[PDB]
Design a protein around this ligand. Structure first.
Ligand SMILES: [Mg+2]
Ligand SMILES: [Mg+2]
Ligand SMILES: [Mg+2]
Ligand SMILES: [Mg+2]
Ligand SMILES: [Mg+2]
Ligand SMILES: [Mg+2]
Ligand SMILES: [Mg+2]
Ligand SMILES: [Zn+2]
Lengths: 56, 196, 67, 51
RNA sequence: CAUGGAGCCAAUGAACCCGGGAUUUCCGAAUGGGACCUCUCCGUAGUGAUCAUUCAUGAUCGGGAACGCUCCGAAUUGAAACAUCUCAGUAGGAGCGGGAAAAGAAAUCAAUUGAGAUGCCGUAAGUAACGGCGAGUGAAACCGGCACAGUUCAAACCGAA
């Protein structure tokens, strides 16, 4: 058995579900937090200054 | 010396170790340690200090006692590569004073008010207790009060978190003028935090 | 011209407004029912105009404080 | 027989009816300038980002 | 968007644009409980949490391109190595917040006698100052301008006025 195509047929399950707040498939099913908008962790939307570049 | 009784309270609290305030301190810290982090009280422990700081005997003003740990900003040793000057953190106490910490916690617990001032009320080995004055900017009495109606302006919401209180302005190096404030006034952020 | 103008709806009464809404809903049910077979309506603008008429009657009813 | 709730089946229903060609009269009206849309797909390909 | 067939709307003045309303499913600050379920359970019909109060009612919660304020805070790199230094209070982070915010009316700056809140711009000036006195970092005052604004508490005395 290998790490390539042999063990990639075990991908019959999910770790991210479609989040309510943003409709993106980023809601982790174990931590209960969307990794795109942060629903289930915070009221505000997660946005960081490293998501774009320094404006200079 | 026809002095008001507020003067006598201030005299009693000038040197509290050698007055009757020491006995009250030993009797009061037992009750104060049992209380919560942010405890509301009927009357200020030092009424003259509160009145000179801005307390009035009217509705829409709240006085709260806050317990803050003693010592500086306890910090974590970095787990990644540092240049040996940014590696040590035991002897580093931050730029946030304990009075500002207590004021910000009082502002946190009481979201619909504003922090007006605060003052030292007592301390022991592990704690410093500060009494923080808060104002209700949506009570009608404070709206009518012309000496407190400045707090209804939009620029006054969030005073203790934007460093506008008296401990905040002291912490931003604005207690004085002239020499030494070349990098503090009008703001620490204006000079790239070089002052302070 | 139109199915029924909103001025005529203001002219009507509460019971007549309810009767007109019942008849309009029944005719819209019939028109959408014939299209379940896929056959195009003989009056293709009729369905949209009846829905707009139902909207206008509901607007007049809500203005007059009926529900 | 994956066991969907109501919203999952509704999303799969919308995905199913999105996967249809453009009508003929749209192509005729547009002078054949609108001949496809990005939502065409086949079930035996990239899976839906639905559930 | 996008002048195809058949209809519809419009001289009871539509379409379209401005202003004012109505409707505005579910989630979402999401807020009756619950989410791998954008739906589901209880219906006793929903003000969830933290707060102010006369417990009538009211505040905060999220978003906003950057800017503003507060606090926390690297390394690459430069020194032709490298550790103080620099990179740099930068990058990044947490809190708060408005159309601006911060600042703000001397326990000031001067010099032998003066000026008279603050902010920002020019200059002082790569000067003073700091520095393996290496590399580099680095002001303010005076002065010339934009704009001009001064006041309120605590207290003394009175005592619910
Ligand atoms: Mg930036
Ligand atoms: Mg706490
Ligand atoms: Mg201001
Ligand atoms: Mg080098
Ligand atoms: Mg906010
Ligand atoms: Mg000020
Ligand atoms: Mg520097
Ligand atoms: Zn999400």
């Amino acid at each position: 058995m290998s790490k390539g195509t042999s063990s990639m047929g075990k991908r019959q399950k999910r770790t991210h579900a479609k989040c309510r707040r943003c409709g993106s498939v980023s809601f982790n099913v174990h931590t209960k937090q969307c990794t795109s908008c942060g629903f289930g962790k915070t009221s505000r939307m997660r946005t960081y200054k490293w998501q774009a570049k320094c404006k200079y | 010396m026809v002095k008001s009784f507020y003067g006598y309270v201030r005299d009693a609290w000038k040197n509290p170790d050698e007055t009757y305030v020491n006995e009250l301190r030993w009797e009061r810290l037992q009750v104060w340690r049992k209380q919560g982090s942010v405890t509301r009280i009927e009357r200020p422990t030092r009424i003259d200090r509160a009145r000179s700081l801005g307390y009035k005997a009217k509705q829409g003003i709240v006085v709260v006692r806050v317990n803050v740990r003693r010592g500086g900003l306890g910090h974590v040793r970095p787990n990644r590569g540092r240049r040996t000057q940014k590696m040590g953190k035991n002897k580093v106490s931050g730029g946030m004073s304990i009075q500002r910490i207590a004021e910000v916690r009082a502002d946190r617990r009481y979201p619909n008010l504003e922090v007006l001032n605060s003052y030292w009320v007592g301390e022991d080995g592990k704690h410093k207790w500060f009494e923080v004055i808060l104002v209700d900017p949506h009570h009608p009495v404070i709206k009518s009060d012309k000496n407190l109606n400045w707090v209804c302006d939009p620029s006054s919401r969030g005073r203790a978190t934007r460093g506008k209180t008296s401990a905040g302005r002291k912490g931003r190096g604005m207690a004085t003028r002239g020499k030494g404030t070349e990098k503090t006034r009008p703001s620490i952020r204006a000079y790239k935090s070089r002052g302070k | 011209m139109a199915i029924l103008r909103t001025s005529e709806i203001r002219t009507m009464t509460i019971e007549e407004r309810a009767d007109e809404l019942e008849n309009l809903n029944n005719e819209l049910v019939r028109e959408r029912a014939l299209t379940s077979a896929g056959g195009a309506p003989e009056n293709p603008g009729r369905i949209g105009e009846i829905r707009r008429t139902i909207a206008r009657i509901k607007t007049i009813q809500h203005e007059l404080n009926e529900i | 027989m994956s066991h969907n709730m109501k919203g999952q089946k509704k999303r799969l229903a919308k995905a199913h009816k999105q996967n249809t060609r453009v009508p003929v009269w749209v192509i005729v009206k547009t002078n054949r300038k609108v001949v496809s849309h990005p939502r065409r797909r086949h079930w035996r390909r990239r899976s839906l980002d639905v559930k």
